[PDB]
């Protein structure tokens, strides 16, 4: 493991942008350079990276957004911009592409199905499940697991049952949110990336259900999916109680007969 | 918009950037678009936090007083080499996860066993590297005895790297 | 999240052993006793009818 240097702390903005170019845009395989959208995802990653890491390494760098970032990048490394589209119009085409990417998420429940784990993004807005956009040739449970791990820091490997889910199509955007139970309310949930998640909190599922049945609130998707959710918590709580009665039984029968 | 122009700009800019991390780089030998790295310990692989383009490059060690830099400040983390700079080749992954890149020194077997023939035996104790391919994973036993495995995206390159690495281990170094 | 080390029993013949690792597809035990002892025992969820846990390493 040879010792390397940290030029990001001491390079001009131009050379830092060149570094980001070799990291995110210059060396990607051909399919990632096929369309404006495919590369704009790499521009996006590079801008996030600049904001989170290199701007905090060299406080002489300015605060850029993805628009200003794309401007500067195409300024310093013109040979990577292969199309004759304004980077702004390219941005509108980027959002249009995102509009119809399947989203996989997870309704996450306490073992006592009293509370459900929801989060709000930087523009606080409303609350919803941990969710994310699907990747290249990826199963819905792999996408759900990956995205809830990035958004919350929690792995849903054993907790996801691939048949318990809700599916809703809103604007060609295919939403699929799995149903999980038995995660600890103990765990400390941190997002993997900053400036992405505003808050992560449990909510009283009974009070939340009464609240969504408002006269007119504070929620996205969950209001649209509330009845399948509640149904799920009914079958699960009821099934826990039935497992209690069942346990009482088997122990008593093994008392009537001889275990030893 | 010309393929020949873009490849030259890729080589030149990759060298310009890598040189800002390893100033002793002399020539790019190999490159692959994407590579993920795992470390081996506890008899199971652990996926490390490095991901991106992989470059194998020649290094300049004509200087003999060459001493390595230092960091401005349990065995899970790797050992960064100190002492005399006598490593002919280098491997680096340009990370897209965080600012820290993946570095692996490559010293051929001849240069190492020749380094043995030196009185102090005080410079850092090393071991000859090894390299293997198994089910598309490229495993490397480093000088520091740590062992890693590399999953390169492009399939054709999985063989290439190996041979090249093997080459860089077996032969005397020049040009 | 980890339950390695729990005292475990599996059935079809019954195997008792210490949990070495668990995945959706595979289950590994050490010092498995046979309805015979074995230092390492590899079993797949396909050959398991049922599982029970009694004792913990605390």
């Amino acid at each position: 493991s040879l010792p390397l240097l940290r030029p990001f702390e001491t390079v001009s903005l131009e050379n830092a942008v060149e570094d980001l170019v070799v990291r995110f845009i210059l060396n990607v395989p051909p399919e990632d350079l096929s369309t404006v959208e495919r590369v704009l995802f790499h521009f996006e990653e590079a801008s996030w990276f600049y904001t989170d890491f290199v701007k905090l390494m060299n406080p002489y760098l300015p605060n850029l957004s993805i628009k200003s970032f794309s401007k500067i990048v195409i300024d310093i490394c013109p040979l990577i911009w292969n199309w004759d589209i304004t980077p702004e119009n390219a941005l509108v085409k980027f959002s249009n592409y995102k509009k119809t990417i399947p989203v996989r998420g997870a309704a996450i429940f306490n073992d006592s199905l009293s509370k459900i784990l929801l989060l709000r993004g930087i523009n606080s807005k409303h609350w919803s499940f941990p969710r994310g956009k699907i990747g290249k040739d990826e199963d819905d449970v792999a996408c759900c697991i990956r995205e809830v791990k990035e958004q919350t820091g929690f792995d849903l490997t054993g907790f996801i049952d691939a048949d318990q889910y809700v599916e809703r199509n809103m604007n060609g955007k295919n939403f699929k949110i799995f149903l999980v139970k038995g995660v600890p309310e103990d765990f400390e949930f941190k997002p993997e990336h900053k400036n992405e998640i505003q808050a992560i909190e449990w909510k009283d599922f009974k009070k939340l259900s009464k609240a969504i049945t408002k006269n007119e609130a504070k929620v996205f998707l969950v209001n649209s999916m509330i009845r399948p959710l509640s149904l799920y918590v009914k079958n699960e709580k009821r099934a826990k109680d039935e497992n209690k009665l069942k346990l009482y039984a088997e122990e008593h029968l093994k008392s009537i007969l001889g275990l030893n | 918009m010309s393929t020949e122009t873009l490849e030259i700009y890729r080589k030149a800019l990759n060298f310009n950037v890598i040189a800002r991390y390893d100033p002793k780089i002399k020539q790019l030998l190999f490159h692959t678009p994407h590579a993920t790295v795992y470390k081996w310990g506890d008899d199971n692989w652990n996926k490390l936090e490095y991901q991106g383009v992989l470059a194998i490059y020649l290094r300049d060690v004509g200087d003999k007083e060459a001493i390595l830099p230092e960091v401005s400040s349990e065995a899970n983390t790797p050992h960064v080499l100190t002492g005399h700079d006598i490593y002919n080749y280098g491997l680096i992954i340009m990370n897209r996860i965080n600012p820290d890149n993946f570095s692996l020194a490559i010293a051929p077997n001849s240069v190492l066993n020749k380094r043995k023939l030196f009185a102090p035996n005080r410079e850092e104790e090393l071991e000859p590297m090894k390299v293997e391919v198994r089910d598309d994973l490229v495993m490397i036993k480093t000088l520091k005895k740590e062992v890693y495995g590399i999953w390169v995206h492009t399939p054709e390159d999985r063989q290439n790297i190996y041979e090249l690495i093997k080459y860089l281990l077996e032969n005397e170094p020049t040009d | 999240l980890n339950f390695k080390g729990y005292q475990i029993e599996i059935e079809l013949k019954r195997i008792t052993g210490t949990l070495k690792q668990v995945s959706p597809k595979s289950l590994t035990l050490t010092d498995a006793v046979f309805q015979g002892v074995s230092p390492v025992f590899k079993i797949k969820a396909d050959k398991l009818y049922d599982l029970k846990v009694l004792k913990l390493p605390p």
Binding site: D32, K133, K136 | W45, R134, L137 | -
Partner: peptide, 23 residues
């Protein structure tokens, strides 16, 4: 309109399918 992120974003295999070094 199919997927998001890098084409290689989710291609890395899990450690449970990887070969043992054995050298």
């Amino acid at each position: 309109k199919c997927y998001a992120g890098a084409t290689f974003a989710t291609e890395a295999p899990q450690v449970t399918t990887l070969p043992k070094p054995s050298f």
